[PDB]
Design a protein around this nucleic acid. Structure first.
Ligand SMILES: [Mg+2]
Ligand SMILES: [Mg+2]
Length: 664
DNA sequence: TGAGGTAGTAGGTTGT
RNA sequence: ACAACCUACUACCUC
């Protein structure tokens, strides 16, 4: 559809000068010849110690300052060791904004120059490359500030670029004893005053600090120098952030509270244009010209119930895109008896429209019966039950998870619906109903349209603490197809192992080969952030050998900055090319919208096309009912799948149908 | 546990 | 330590 012009929260500034396009170069020289694994955290530390504006350039420094006015000789204490540096001038070296390699450096210096010129300005705050200008609260002990977070790089032409985005700080000005005595509840986070390590403040200790055995609190922390200039308070039984179970005593005097809980797009645009003007001139960088880019309102998707719909909730009266014969059991954990009538009517209305038939069972049993309860589950499944609705008061995480896993071990997904529930809460129970139905394995909605790819799979990592899970969900059938998940696999990090990516992918290829009678002509591959170097290498090879076409795309929930209209309102579905191989996509519009940032990593489909499918896949998600997810359904699904599997383990899923969206 | 979202604390992996 | 992404909490708003 239409073109448009939009404002990016970037601003063009002055060209770099003849001296800036040619930094001085320096050769570092450390005493304890550097460790092989420490040279980066440390070389970056020397660039800072050098003074002036100077960054790391390979294994030396690039400086925008003549060596004569740098601290070329110093010492350095990192992780306990004391290294002694010495900087040697190695003349100067021109850099080419054209060459993105040398441009990497010019933007490194740019960030320094930015933060170093923010440092010398009175009446503000500089927590990193961010500035806090107009204070926001007088407060009573605690001060919350206004301001903005900034960034500053170079460009192809060789000009500075200044990204700007409004922000806030929540700072404390007292002690864990002083602030808590000032009349406020106990904090969740609490950082040491003599260090930067943090703890999960659990409780207070009804024990004497002096006579308390330390596997003595009074004697141990005082014999470190902490007792000076301060007065340790009472025992504060804290617990590690890594090991959440084991407590460790500590003094409420040596602790500071890490306070936390305690803008509109019209306004945000404003505040951004202001902060940019000021900074532009107090910086000697010129008048801030608001960069503009061409946008494109993408063609709205055709959501299909049985008849077309605007929201998945509508399928509840129009009928489902593909309903089958389905049995749903009810489990109540409160005292009550049967299905609330309005819930019965509602399901029946929706199932009538769709055609096929509905059986409504009841589970007369309670988890408290132990194995008996499972046996009741086994019979429900036996009578064709597919999912269960659980009416109950709010469960606690631990009991919630136990229940969910319990039912899944008998292949019953389940939807929880909290029980103080009045019929006029239509939004709640309709969403619960949608959840119930997707968990049962129905396709509640689909898309009408032709797309480049007939198979779209999303890959996420991680729902766990120590290790994580790599998983994939997919929409199969280009048609605007039907949805399914695959068994996740545990992994050490964020990187999904190459063999796993392929294997998960092949499960979706096979799902396709079972629905249509062929291989897909082309798959769209979504990844949930950075694509770790070469992660899809093996997978993409295989797709070739098999004759399947593909497109890979990093989809990033952050980094896309902001997008404002030159005039009018922001529409749903703005596609905004940028540096080739990357574009923003503004898929939804609380306050100010955060656009996805997408990087076409591999494959030869045009950006607009990828941007078309992705935006549309945004509306495929069946469990949201009255609002769409910012993310394509395949990645939203995978995100959920990876979280549920981390909440409650992989062991339970062996007998659950990949077509039943149990994690929604 | 109805589901979306922005936005403020914290901390983790990949990468040079 | 820095970038790039990711994640957890909580608060707030919405149909
Ligand atoms: Mg992720
Ligand atoms: Mg759900």
């Amino acid at each position: 559809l239409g073109k448009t012009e939009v404002f990016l929260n970037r601003f063009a500034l002055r060209p770099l000068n003849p001296e800036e396009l040619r930094p001085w170069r320096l050769e570092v020289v450390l005493d304890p010849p550097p460790g092989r694994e420490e040279v980066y955290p440390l070389l970056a530390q020397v660039a800072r110690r050098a003074g002036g504006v100077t960054v790391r350039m390979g294994d030396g420094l690039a400086s925008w300052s003549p060596p004569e006015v740098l601290v070329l000789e110093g010492t350095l204490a990192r992780m306990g060791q004391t290294y002694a540096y010495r900087l040697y001038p190695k003349g100067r070296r021109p850099l080419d904004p054209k060459d993105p390699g040398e441009r990497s450096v010019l933007s490194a210096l740019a960030r320094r120059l930015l933060q170093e010129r923010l440092r010398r300005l009175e009446g503000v705050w500089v927590e990193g490359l961010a500035v806090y200008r107009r204070e926001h609260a007088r407060g009573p002990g605690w001060r919350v500030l206004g301001g903005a977070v900034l960034d500053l790089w170079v460009s192809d032409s060789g000009a500075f670029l200044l990204e700007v985005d409004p922000a806030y700080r929540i700072l404390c000005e007292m002690s864990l004893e002083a602030w808590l005595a000032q009349g406020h509840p106990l904090p969740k986070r609490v950082r040491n005053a003599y260090d930067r390590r943090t703890w999960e403040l659990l409780r207070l200790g009804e024990e004497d600090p002096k006579e308390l055995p330390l596997p003595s609190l009074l004697d141990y922390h005082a014999s470190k120098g902490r007792l000076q200039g301060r007065e340790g308070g009472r025992v504060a039984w804290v617990a590690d952030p890594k090991d959440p179970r084991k407590p460790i005593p500590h003094l409420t005097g040596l602790l500071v509270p890490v306070l936390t809980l305690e803008l509109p797009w019209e306004e945000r645009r404003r505040r951004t244009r202001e902060i940019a003007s000021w900074i532009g001139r107090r910086l000697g960088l010129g008048t801030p010209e608001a960069v503009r880019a061409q946008a494109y309102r993408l063609s709205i998707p055709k959501l299909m119930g049985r008849r077309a719909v605007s929201k998945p909730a509508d399928a509840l009266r129009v009928g489902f895109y593909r309903a089958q014969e389905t049995a749903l059991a009810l489990l109540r954990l409160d005292g009550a008896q049967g299905w609330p009538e309005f819930l019965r009517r509602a399901l029946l209305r929706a199932f009538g429209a769709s055609g096929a038939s509905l059986r409504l069972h009841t589970l007369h049993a309670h988890p408290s019966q132990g194995l008996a309860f499972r046996e009741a589950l086994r019979k429900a499944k036996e009578e064709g039950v597919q999912a269960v609705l659980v009416l109950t008061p709010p469960m606690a995480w631990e009991d919630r998870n136990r229940l969910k896993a319990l039912l899944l071990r008998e292949g019953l997904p389940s939807q929880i619906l909290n029980v103080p529930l009045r019929e006029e809460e239509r939004h709640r129970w309709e969403n619960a109903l949608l959840g119930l139905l997707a968990k049962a394995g129905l396709q509640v909605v689909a898309l009408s349209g032709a797309y480049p790819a007939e198979l779209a799979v999303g890959f996420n990592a991680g729902g766990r603490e120590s290790f994580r899970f790599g998983g994939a969900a997919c929409a199969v059938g280009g048609d605007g197809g039907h949805l399914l998940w695959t068994l996740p696999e545990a992994q050490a990090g964020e990187r999904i192992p190459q063999e796993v990516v392929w294997d998960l992918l092949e499960e979706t290829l096979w799902a396709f080969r079972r629905k249509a009678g062929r291989l897909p002509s082309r798959v769209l591959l979504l990844r949930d952030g950075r694509v770790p170097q070469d992660e899809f290498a093996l997978a993409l090879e295989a797709l070739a050998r098999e004759g399947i076409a593909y497109d890979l795309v990093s989809v990033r929930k952050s980094g896309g900055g902001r997008v404002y209209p030159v005039q009018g309102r922001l529409a749903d579905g703005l596609y905004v090319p940028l540096e080739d191989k990357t574009f923003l996509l503004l898929t939804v519009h609380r306050g100010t919208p955060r656009p996805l940032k997408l990087v076409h990593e591999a494959g030869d489909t045009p950006l607009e096309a990828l941007a078309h499918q992705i935006f549309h896949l945004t509306r495929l998600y069946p469990a949201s009912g009255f609002a769409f997810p910012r993310l394509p359904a395949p990645l939203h699904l995978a995100d959920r799948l990876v979280k549920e599997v981390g909440r409650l383990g992989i062991r339970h899923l062996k007998e659950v149908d990949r077509e039943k969206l149990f994690f929604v």
